[PDB]
From Swiss-Prot, chain A:
Protein's cellular compartments: Cytoplasm, Cytoskeleton
Highest taxon of the lineage: Eukaryota
Free-text note regarding domains: The molecule is in a coiled coil structure that is formed by 2 polypeptide chains. The sequence exhibits a prominent seven-residues periodicity.
Family: Belongs to the tropomyosin family.
Biological function: Binds to actin filaments in muscle and non-muscle cells. Plays a central role, in association with the troponin complex, in the calcium dependent regulation of vertebrate striated muscle contraction. Smooth muscle contraction is regulated by interaction with caldesmon. In non-muscle cells is implicated in stabilizing cytoskeleton actin filaments.
Annotated disorder: Cardiomyopathy, familial hypertrophic, 3: A hereditary heart disorder characterized by ventricular hypertrophy, which is usually asymmetric and often involves the interventricular septum. The symptoms include dyspnea, syncope, collapse, palpitations, and chest pain. They can be readily provoked by exercise. The disorder has inter- and intrafamilial variability ranging from benign to malignant forms with high risk of cardiac failure and sudden cardiac death. Cardiomyopathy, dilated, 1Y: A disorder characterized by ventricular dilation and impaired systolic function, resulting in congestive heart failure and arrhythmia. Patients are at risk of premature death.
Positions of modified residues (Phosphoserine): 54
Residue span of region Disordered: 1-16
Species per Swiss-Prot/TrEMBL record: Homo sapiens
Subunit structure comment from the entry: Homodimer. Heterodimer of an alpha (TPM1, TPM3 or TPM4) and a beta (TPM2) chain. Interacts with HRG (via the HRR domain); the interaction contributes to the antiangiogenic properties of the histidine/proline-rich region (HRR) of HRG. Interacts (via N-terminus) with LMOD2 (via N-terminus) and TMOD1 (via N-terminus).
Gene encoding the protein: TPM1
Protein name (database record): Tropomyosin alpha-1 chain
Length: 55, 55
């Protein structure tokens, strides 16, 4: 029962951890996508800066 | 006296034998209860092994 309760708490916890993990995955991906766009936008302005600097 | 002691020795023998007979019954009854208790013990222990194994 301790081991079964262990599993119920742990399985639920493992799921909570799976969810927190999924949440960190979603959040890092959103943040990463912000970074993809922040970096993309950076590239657009950095590229434009090069073009504008060249100009 | 030999005859009275004989009636009493035979009685004592009868009583001692009667006690052996009562006691033979106590043996068969306790012997069977012990075999059963050993089986009950084995059962509790086998259940313990299965419960522990379940654990």
């Amino acid at each position: 029962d301790e081991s079964e309760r262990g599993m119920k708490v742990i399985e639920s916890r493992a799921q909570k951890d799976e969810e927190k993990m999924e949440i960190q995955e979603i959040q890092l991906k959103e943040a990463k996508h912000i970074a993809e766009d922040a970096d993309r936008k950076y590239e657009e302005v950095a590229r434009k800066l090069v073009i504008i600097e060249s100009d | 006296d030999a005859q009275e002691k004989l009636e009493l020795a035979e009685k004592k023998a009868t009583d001692a034998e009667a006690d052996v007979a009562s006691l033979n019954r106590r043996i068969q009854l306790v012997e069977e209860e012990l075999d059963r208790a050993q089986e009950r013990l084995a059962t509790a222990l086998q259940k313990l092994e299965e419960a522990e194994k379940a654990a």
